[PDB]
Scaffold this active site. Structure first.
Site, PDB file in Angstrom:
ATOM      1  N   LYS A 118      -6.294 -12.324  -2.035  1.00 12.80           N
ATOM      2  CA  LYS A 118      -6.847 -11.328  -1.289  1.00 12.80           C
ATOM      3  C   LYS A 118      -8.298 -11.705  -0.769  1.00 12.80           C
ATOM      4  O   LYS A 118      -8.926 -12.539  -1.541  1.00 12.80           O
ATOM      5  CB  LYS A 118      -7.098  -9.980  -2.486  1.00 12.80           C
ATOM      6  CG  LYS A 118      -5.661  -9.051  -2.655  1.00 12.80           C
ATOM      7  CD  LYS A 118      -5.364  -8.550  -1.402  1.00 12.80           C
ATOM      8  CE  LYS A 118      -3.937  -8.281  -1.173  1.00 12.80           C
ATOM      9  NZ  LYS A 118      -3.346  -7.498  -2.138  1.00 12.80           N
TER      10      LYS A 118
ATOM     11  N   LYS B 125       1.139 -17.178  -4.347  1.00  4.86           N
ATOM     12  CA  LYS B 125       1.997 -16.541  -3.156  1.00  4.86           C
ATOM     13  C   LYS B 125       1.372 -16.215  -2.130  1.00  4.86           C
ATOM     14  O   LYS B 125       0.177 -15.847  -2.025  1.00  4.86           O
ATOM     15  CB  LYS B 125       2.781 -15.573  -3.712  1.00  4.86           C
ATOM     16  CG  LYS B 125       3.160 -14.583  -2.966  1.00  4.86           C
ATOM     17  CD  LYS B 125       4.068 -13.303  -3.422  1.00  4.86           C
ATOM     18  CE  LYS B 125       4.903 -12.602  -2.466  1.00  4.86           C
ATOM     19  NZ  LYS B 125       4.095 -11.660  -1.569  1.00  4.86           N
ATOM     20  N   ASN B 126       1.624 -16.413  -0.675  1.00  2.53           N
ATOM     21  CA  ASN B 126       1.246 -15.837   0.578  1.00  2.53           C
ATOM     22  C   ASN B 126       1.580 -14.524   0.548  1.00  2.53           C
ATOM     23  O   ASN B 126       2.306 -14.068  -0.027  1.00  2.53           O
ATOM     24  CB  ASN B 126       1.910 -16.738   1.732  1.00  2.53           C
ATOM     25  CG  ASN B 126       1.392 -17.793   2.433  1.00  2.53           C
ATOM     26  OD1 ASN B 126       2.018 -18.592   2.842  1.00  2.53           O
ATOM     27  ND2 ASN B 126       0.185 -17.861   2.807  1.00  2.53           N
ATOM     28  N   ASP B 127       0.491 -13.845   1.136  1.00  2.18           N
ATOM     29  CA  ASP B 127       0.721 -12.254   1.229  1.00  2.18           C
ATOM     30  C   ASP B 127       1.791 -12.262   2.274  1.00  2.18           C
ATOM     31  O   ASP B 127       1.752 -13.114   3.171  1.00  2.18           O
ATOM     32  CB  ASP B 127      -0.463 -11.215   1.632  1.00  2.18           C
ATOM     33  CG  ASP B 127      -0.145  -9.871   0.974  1.00  2.18           C
ATOM     34  OD1 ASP B 127      -1.022  -9.007   1.445  1.00  2.18           O
ATOM     35  OD2 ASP B 127       0.721  -9.465   0.599  1.00  2.18           O
ATOM     36  N   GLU B 128       2.678 -11.323   2.459  1.00  2.00           N
ATOM     37  CA  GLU B 128       3.920 -11.098   3.298  1.00  2.00           C
ATOM     38  C   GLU B 128       3.500 -11.308   4.657  1.00  2.00           C
ATOM     39  O   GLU B 128       4.270 -12.123   5.268  1.00  2.00           O
ATOM     40  CB  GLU B 128       4.502  -9.681   3.045  1.00  2.00           C
ATOM     41  CG  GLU B 128       3.917  -8.267   3.127  1.00  2.00           C
ATOM     42  CD  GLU B 128       3.369  -7.586   2.351  1.00  2.00           C
ATOM     43  OE1 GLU B 128       3.897  -7.429   1.240  1.00  2.00           O
ATOM     44  OE2 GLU B 128       1.991  -7.260   2.412  1.00  2.00           O
TER      45      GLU B 128
ATOM     46  N   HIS C 126      11.092 -11.825  -1.051  1.00  2.00           N
ATOM     47  CA  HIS C 126       9.985 -10.562  -1.095  1.00  2.00           C
ATOM     48  C   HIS C 126      10.718  -9.374  -0.223  1.00  2.00           C
ATOM     49  O   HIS C 126      11.266  -9.649   0.528  1.00  2.00           O
ATOM     50  CB  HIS C 126       8.637 -10.912  -0.687  1.00  2.00           C
ATOM     51  CG  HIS C 126       7.766  -9.621  -0.599  1.00  2.00           C
ATOM     52  ND1 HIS C 126       7.007  -9.391   0.285  1.00  2.00           N
ATOM     53  CD2 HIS C 126       7.755  -8.741  -1.425  1.00  2.00           C
ATOM     54  CE1 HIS C 126       6.333  -8.267   0.189  1.00  2.00           C
ATOM     55  NE2 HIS C 126       6.952  -7.668  -0.784  1.00  2.00           N
TER      56      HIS C 126
ATOM     57  N   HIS D  43      11.526  -9.818  -5.893  1.00  2.00           N
ATOM     58  CA  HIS D  43      10.495  -8.738  -6.334  1.00  2.00           C
ATOM     59  C   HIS D  43      11.545  -7.445  -6.897  1.00  2.00           C
ATOM     60  O   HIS D  43      12.389  -7.082  -6.489  1.00  2.00           O
ATOM     61  CB  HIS D  43       9.735  -8.365  -5.014  1.00  2.00           C
ATOM     62  CG  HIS D  43       8.566  -7.471  -5.379  1.00  2.00           C
ATOM     63  ND1 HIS D  43       8.150  -6.977  -6.641  1.00  2.00           N
ATOM     64  CD2 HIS D  43       7.687  -6.663  -4.708  1.00  2.00           C
ATOM     65  CE1 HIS D  43       7.422  -6.123  -6.889  1.00  2.00           C
ATOM     66  NE2 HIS D  43       6.800  -6.172  -5.354  1.00  2.00           N
TER      67      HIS D  43
ATOM     68  N   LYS E 158       3.265   7.316 -14.407  1.00  2.00           N
ATOM     69  CA  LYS E 158       3.363   6.908 -15.915  1.00  2.00           C
ATOM     70  C   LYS E 158       3.351   8.303 -16.627  1.00  2.00           C
ATOM     71  O   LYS E 158       3.911   8.282 -17.991  1.00  2.00           O
ATOM     72  CB  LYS E 158       2.008   6.672 -15.979  1.00  2.00           C
ATOM     73  CG  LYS E 158       1.086   7.164 -17.063  1.00  2.00           C
ATOM     74  CD  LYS E 158       0.044   6.377 -17.620  1.00  2.00           C
ATOM     75  CE  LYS E 158      -0.733   6.934 -18.691  1.00  2.00           C
ATOM     76  NZ  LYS E 158      -0.227   7.443 -19.854  1.00  2.00           N
TER      77      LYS E 158
END
Ligand SMILES: [Mg+2]
Ligand SMILES: [Mg+2]
Lengths: 437, 444
Positions: free
Chosen positions: B155, B180-183, B276, B310, B318
């Site tokens: 990020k 991991k690479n962001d999408e 993903h 994923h 919750k």
């Protein structure tokens, strides 16, 4: 979540278009329930750009309208992914940016893209169609400009016919019609292997052309998961078709196989018409759904991608001009294509020859491929006569000759009159007397 | 020709056992005014043969109007197969069982909730080539129950220049395993893929020298063109050189589709294919009454050959309800779905990749519930939300699995482990609700 950074209600949309360095997206988004409209829009912009957790790369919300649930985002062009290979854009990036994580966000109830705008710099990076219905017009002996109506169907039953039987039905439709489509699932089924079926179809094509003196067209389903399978099908049909390879369109089920499927064929067979079949598009591009995108956006994406033709439905027209024209007006954005070829509308179902011209007039041209159900071919001398009648109806429309006058000198057209008596006497009262029939 | 497509005398146990039919279970509701069985027979007609050539008809074998349940039996002969190698294709499975029926005249919504593929057909699918076991091998763990892999996403999502990017990875790798690479990250102009992958491979060498451990990276190779995909893949493996076995190939399978995935699965069968799921909510969503379930989605991915997929991000819900049978469906050899028990004949498992706010305190309960810790965790808040930073955040998750694995009470372990002790003070609320009065225990 941060507003302040990703919201600039105050940005003139024209300025944005004027300096062509932002992709524009217009959605119908609804904040969950308890959340703030503009807060949520800041957040949707955020999750579709830089996220955070530099700001020349940020997705700015430039217009909002809570009553109407209208959210507009401006995406810097630098965000889009490009090929390392040939430097071209990809549709996969565009989807990912403007519709990925944002489609499963607790916070947003729904969000559906209604229109998008691509500037020149970006738009010019896309593949675009390599051929369209002009390729077909060139096969049929028609003019490259305003060639008219291509009469087609789908062979039914959708699955079941063995190879001879499929070939045979193709031949019989070819006595009166121009184009035949494999239905969606026809491929390499055990009972009708693709190699067999296609060689027989190929021969049905030479038989039909010989007996009629007219060029015939086939649209062969080449869809698969594996691109090399896609390619192996493509190369097989063309070679089998041989001297008639220019008469074959390559069908890709594109929705269920995705963009690579469409891109394989588009880049491997740039000389054959890439027929984009919209299979199961229906779970996203259906008004019953408030998520994903609309048919207009779906179809506008197809041009850029390179479909030569795409099933459009049967507004059906904003789609049509947007695909066809060098400048069109969509729901919110008007767009220029800078010379990018047209992607031909492909319409379904069908009307009879009497109804035909209503459609032509409404659209303003007859530059479409008709994939008609056998109902459109329901005619008293048969379906051969039935398909001729549609052709004769297009012809009278283009000469600007009245159907009734064209009908006296064209038997199948006149017989369609008696075939749908109540349609005839409604649309062209006289007819009975008038045709002496 | 309707009642040609219905046969409610067929027994589901005979269909399964005959192992000649693909069974689908939908939540189908006809449009107002149309008979259930008639509407169902329509859908079967138009999903197989049609007419509008009879031994290949799809048959409605069971229906239940009140629960809006339609179960159809599709003969295996209907499904398309590769002319090149004779193997099955998801594209055909989708076109037939779902596709065409996604706007069916007398039918207002239809959603597939489960499917059953007989042995004969299931064996035509690719199936995963590798799973978490190739990660374990690289990391040094046992290939059987090697445990939890802790990762993250870098990020900001987008905006980091090559060098800064590579140093953010480096920094994370000091405390965790996988990055991991962001999408969306690929070849944007501010961060060319080629430069950034060169620098990331470098931070991988660096981080591996300073920790004396194996680090993992998932590089996004999603593209429209197969050859661009193939080129991204070849460039990335090449660049990582010695560390090529440490790279997972990330492919956004929802937005590029089935052929993207098959491109990566067959061109690079040795590397972990990280599937993903992005865009997917559009159809998958509980909210949507058309397309298919996430369970269905996940099950398809095993057959296509995704290495990991994923799942269960949760969000802020919750109740509870479903999303459980997915874990077992993805990894067992025999599992029970919402309608059908599925045998996988030794077809490799596909690994759950979980996301979100899994902090070190909730970890143990999660594992107790799944029955194991064999997943890849792409931590955000669990990592990032720790008072000592993401690195301590990462170490605390590793620490929490270790306690769990060894059957050691968390508080005991927390007492001996600084990072785990400080997870408690990072997420106070979590600690009240799961570790009554940890305060005393840990000493403030
Ligand atoms: Mg169809
Ligand atoms: Mg993410």
């Amino acid at each position: 979540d941060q507003s302040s950074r990703y919201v600039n209600l105050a940005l003139k949309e024209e300025d944005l278009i004027a300096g062509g360095e932002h992709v524009l997206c217009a959605y119908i988004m609804k904040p969950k329930a308890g959340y703030g409209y503009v807060a949520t829009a800041a957040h949707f912009a955020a999750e579709s750009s830089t996220g955070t957790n530099t700001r020349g790369v940020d997705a700015l919300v430039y217009e909002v309208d809570e009553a109407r649930e209208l959210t507009k985002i401006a995406y810097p062009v630098a965000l889009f992914d490009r090929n390392i290979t040939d430097g071209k854009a990809m549709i996969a990036s565009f989807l990912t940016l403007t519709m990925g994580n944002n489609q499963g966000m607790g916070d947003v109830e729904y969000a559906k893209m209604h229109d998008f705008y691509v500037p020149e710099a970006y738009r010019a990076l896309f593949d675009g169609p390599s051929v369209n219905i002009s390729a077909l017009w060139k096969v049929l002996g028609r003019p490259e400009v305003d060639g008219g109506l291509v009469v087609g169907t789908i062979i039914k039953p959708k699955l079941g016919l063995r190879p001879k039987p499929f070939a045979e039905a193709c031949h019989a439709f070819w006595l009166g019609g121009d184009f035949i489509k494999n239905d969606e699932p026809q491929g390499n089924q055990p009972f009708a292997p693709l190699r067999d079926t296609i060689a027989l179809v190929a021969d049905a094509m030479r038989r039909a052309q010989d007996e009629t003196g007219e060029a015939k067209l086939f649209s062969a389903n080449i869809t698969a998961d594996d691109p090399f399978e896609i390619i192996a099908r493509g190369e097989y049909v063309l070679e089998t078709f041989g001297e008639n390879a220019s008469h074959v369109a390559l069908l890709v089920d594109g929705y269920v196989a995705g963009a690579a499927a469409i891109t394989t064929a588009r880049r491997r067979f740039p000389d054959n018409f890439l027929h984009y079949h919209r299979a199961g598009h229906g779970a996203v591009t259906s008004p019953q759904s408030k998520r994903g995108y609309t048919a207009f956006v779906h179809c506008k994406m197809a041009r850029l991608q390179g479909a030569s033709g795409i099933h459009t439905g049967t507004s059906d027209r904003a789609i049509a001009y947007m695909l066809t024209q060098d400048e069109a007006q969509g729901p919110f954005y008007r767009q220029s294509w800078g010379g990018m070829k047209a992607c031909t509308p492909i319409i379904s179902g069908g009307m009879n020859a009497l109804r035909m011209p209503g459609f032509f007039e409404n659209l303003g041209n007859a530059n479409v491929i008709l994939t008609a159900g056998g109902g459109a071919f329901g005619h008293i001398d048969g379906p051969v006569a039935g398909a001729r009648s549609l052709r004769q109806a297009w012809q009278a429309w283009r000469d600007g000759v009245p159907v009734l006058d064209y009908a006296r000198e064209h038997k199948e057209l006149a017989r369609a009159f008696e075939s749908f008596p109540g349609d005839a006497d409604q649309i062209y009262p006289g007819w009975r007397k008038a045709l002496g029939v």
